Design a protein around this nucleic acid. Structure first.
Ligand SMILES: [Zn+2]
Lengths: 177, 111, 27, 60, 43, 64, 181, 103, 53
DNA sequence: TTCATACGCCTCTCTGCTTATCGGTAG
């Protein structure tokens, strides 16, 4: 009843009928919780590469979007983060915002979360190689773009159900409540 | 380890030891509940639960104490205490039969 | 209409200030 | 006005004929409308039924 | 559940299927041979 | 027809193979078919041409 | 010893905290000044009687106002000799030669009589504390940013200032800076 | 013999509001992707149109299911309708199916 | 307009409906997962208003 | 005095917000 109206705007923020924002992102990643099981399943994504390339038809996905700007911003952001990932939380500045804030994650390729970049780089730093990394990154980013919440979802309702329904069988019996 | 010590609970943290720290204490505690039986609901929901904190100043609730500040009073009336809220007025799409504003209703069509 | 509550906490060296805001609101 | 099923265009087919009973034409486009001479333009539709019946500018 | 799926028309069909001036009825009393009209006293 | 489309495309079970609780699947075969799979896929299974073709056709039915 | 060095430690930690406060707000101070090792602190502050007088307790705070590039205006604060103003809160210095800000730190023996006159001068306020000995590993506070041009955000989101999440004036983090309406 | 035209200028009133709260062409900051909800609603509305004796350009299919006919039209992009996708503020971001990718 | 049985939670936030049915479930692997088993009694009962083209 | 019928009276769970006493200080 409290969250009956909160829904995902056309913009990445979540707004009610009145339009009041609750959060600019969806957990800071904007990734739909359904279509996200194999975002980090890099080995399986690498396999069936041609099938994934056929399902995420890249020929049609070039006349309505651009990549270079967001990709360059992401590269600079990651470079600076790696430069200053050692100093503590309170001593860090914001030279560059995370890419999602800067660009529409669903319109500009390469606009992905920070942890996604870190894990993708960690995986790709394993050698063992079609197998071109320059195109593997392109396919992964295309999937990330395709894994975004549509404008008009019933998030909030979904969150309430995901909190309540599992709680029915959550606990029965055996200090803190 | 007197630096690292925490009886982390909204009982005292939100009062002085931060304010937006609600979006890190509420989620941490509610996840720590489901961490017992390892139900492990997605963190996206435990942060979508932010009408509790960000919808106003500090630590709202999902009860009559929170419904007051909501603009449309039809939801408040449909919730408990349909009497008091009606007086102050002198889901709604459901009440009037208007097409909803989510999903296929979150936009319009023409032509 | 807006949050100007703490601006007019001291005007009587009171209603004079609020005349400006409304025209400013449509401005 | 009882809207005929097709009015995204108004070139022919009597789509204007016997339409006033349900002499100019008005078309509402909240977004910046194109040149006001196109034989085609948007028509508002009802949320469920396929009709549009609010108001138009025409006199005689 | 109807809302959670976002099926707006489905919700409308499961939960379904005025005084212009006052906006808050009374009408439809033809007298002799005229059509039914409105005579809202609130108006 | 609007509700028909909503059910067939947004509320249809196939579109809901996963659950937003944790992203895990919820739909699948349960007990009898699990035991049948364990027995069939074991290396101790062999099928003649007749049995193989019959199983495939009964399982598939391409005419549908 | 006794409860002698305890007060000195409390005050030193509070002083470092306030220096961090002003530096975060945008008033440059020396990094080694913000460090201020306690041995150096007691060397500069050592009473002949071994008292919180410290023989040099003339704590002076003045700002830098570096970020004029983004802030078109920025005033000053005059926090002088605020070591031990009194045993309790005493109206003493209502306004000084500063035109936007001012910080008065007290021993939290709050006097509501002195709490008046504060919402009187338009460009001033105060939210001081006893020690406040912030940022911590337990602290998950995201670092705050004062968007001088939030007009860009408002244009890109098509919002009203109210529709954003609201952080109250009394928020301890919102009191770390002079955040306004 | 005109009367109080524009209904006391109210026709002109708030039409300026609609135009002002409307993102113009080439400024559409919306991701081009016919979302599931939009696709479902478009299919249903087109099916309803066809049901109400409406002519359809595509005569390739000879079945009798309006929803299947609408799906075929969506495949062939022969759908004469426009999606209005206004932002929660009220600003309208008009889109056309022809320029919208359905996958 | 009452606490829990009020007009809201009884005739506004939920209603009785037409063209609906209720029964018990008999599992049947011989049907497609996106299909349901409709007895012929329902078939002559539930109707759909469909225009003639 | 009664009968016919309209009238005719009384024991196992807990929050959040009504409000209490009570004094202390600049005036
Ligand atoms: Zn009336």
């Amino acid at each position: 009843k409290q969250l009956e109206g909160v829904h995902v705007s056309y913009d990445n923020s979540i707004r009610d009928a009145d339009g009041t924002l609750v959060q600019f992102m969806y957990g800071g990643d904007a990734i739909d919780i359904t279509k996200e099981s194999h975002m980090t399943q890099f080995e399986f994504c690498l396999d069936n590469y041609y099938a994934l390339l056929k399902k995420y038809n890249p020929s049609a996905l070039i006349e309505h979007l651009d990549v270079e700007s967001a990709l360059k911003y992401s590269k600079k952001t990651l470079k600076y983060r790696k430069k200053h990932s050692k100093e503590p939380h309170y001593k860090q500045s914001v030279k560059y915002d995370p890419v999602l804030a800067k660009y529409n994650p669903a319109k500009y390729l390469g606009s992905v979360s920070e942890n996604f970049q870190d894990k993708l780089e960690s995986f790709l730093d394993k050698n063992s190689k079609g197998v071109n990394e320059k195109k593997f990154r392109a396919l992964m980013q295309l999937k990330y773009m395709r894994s975004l919440i549509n404008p008009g979802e019933a998030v909030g309702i979904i969150a309430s159900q995901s909190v309540g329904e599992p709680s029915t069988q959550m606990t029965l019996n055996t200090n803190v409540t | 380890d007197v630096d690292g010590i925490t009886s982390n609970d909204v009982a005292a943290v939100l009062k002085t030891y931060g304010v937006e720290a609600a979006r890190n204490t509420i989620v941490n505690e509610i996840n720590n509940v489901f961490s017992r039986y390892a139900i492990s609901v997605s963190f996206r929901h435990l942060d979508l639960i932010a009408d509790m904190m960000t919808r106003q100043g500090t630590y709202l609730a999902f009860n009559r104490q929170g419904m007051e500040t909501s603009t449309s009073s039809f939801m408040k009336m449909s919730y408990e205490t349909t009497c008091q809220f009606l007086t102050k007025a002198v889901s709604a799409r459901i009440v009037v039969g208007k097409l909803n504003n989510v999903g296929t209703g979150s936009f319009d069509v023409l032509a | 209409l807006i949050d100007e509550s703490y601006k007019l906490d001291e005007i009587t060296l009171r209603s004079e200030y609020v005349d400006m805001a409304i025209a400013k609101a449509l401005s | 006005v009882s809207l005929a099923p097709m009015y995204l265009e108004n070139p022919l087919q009597g789509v204007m004929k016997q339409h006033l009973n349900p002499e100019g034409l008005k078309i509402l486009d909240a977004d910046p409308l194109s040149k006001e001479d196109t034989s085609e333009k948007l028509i508002k539709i009802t949320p469920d039924t396929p009709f549009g019946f609010t108001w138009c500018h025409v006199n005689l | 559940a109807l809302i959670g799926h976002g099926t707006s028309f489905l919700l409308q069909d499961r939960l379904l299927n005025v005084c212009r001036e006052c906006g808050s009825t009374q009408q439809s009393v033809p007298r002799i041979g005229s059509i039914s009209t409105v005579c809202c006293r609130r108006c | 027809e609007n509700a028909r489309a909503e059910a067939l495309n947004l509320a249809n079970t196939d579109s809901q193979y996963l659950t937003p609780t944790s992203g895990s699947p919820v739909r699948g075969l349960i007990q009898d078919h699990i035991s049948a799979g364990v027995w069939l896929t074991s290396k101790d299974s062999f099928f003649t041409r007749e049995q193989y073709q019959q199983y495939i056709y009964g399982c598939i039915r391409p005419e549908d | 010893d006794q409860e002698n060095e305890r007060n000195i430690s409390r005050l030193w930690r509070a002083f470092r905290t306030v220096k961090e406060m002003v530096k975060d707000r945008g008033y440059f101070i020396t990094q080694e000044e913000v460090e201020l090792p306690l041995e150096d602190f007691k060397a500069k502050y050592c009473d002949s009687m071994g008292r919180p007088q410290r023989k040099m307790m003339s704590f002076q705070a003045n700002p830098t106002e570096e970020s004029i590039s983004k802030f078109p205006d920025m005033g000053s604060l005059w926090v002088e000799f605020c070591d031990e103003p009194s045993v309790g809160v005493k109206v003493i210095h209502i306004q000084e030669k500063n035109f936007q800000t001012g910080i008065f730190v007290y021993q939290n023996n709050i006097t509501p009589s002195a709490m008046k006159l504060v919402p009187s001068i338009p460009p001033a306020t105060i939210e001081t504390f006893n020690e406040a000995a912030t940022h911590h590993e337990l602290v998950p506070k995201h670092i705050r940013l004062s968007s001088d041009e939030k007009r860009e955000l408002l244009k890109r989101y098509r919002l009203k200032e109210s529709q954003l999440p609201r952080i109250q004036r009394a928020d301890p983090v919102a009191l770390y800076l002079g955040l306004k309406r | 013999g005109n009367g109080p035209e524009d209904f006391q200028q109210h026709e002109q009133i708030r039409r300026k509001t609609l135009k002002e709260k409307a993102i113009p062409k080439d400024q559409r900051a919306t991701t081009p992707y016919m979302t599931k909800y939009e696709r479902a609603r478009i299919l249903g509305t087109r099916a309803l149109q066809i049901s109400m004796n409406a002519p359809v350009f595509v005569d390739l299919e000879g079945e009798t299911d309006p929803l299947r006919i609408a799906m075929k039209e969506l495949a062939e992009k022969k759908i004469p309708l426009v999606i209005r996708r206004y932002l929660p503020d009220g600003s309208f971001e008009d889109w056309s199916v022809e320029e919208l990718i359905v996958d | 307009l009452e606490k829990k049985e009020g007009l809201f939670r009884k005739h506004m936030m939920g209603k009785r409906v037409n063209y609906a049915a209720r029964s018990v479930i008999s599992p049947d692997p011989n049907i497609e997962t996106n299909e349901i088993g409709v007895p012929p009694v329902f078939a002559v009962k539930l109707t759909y208003p469909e225009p003639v083209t």
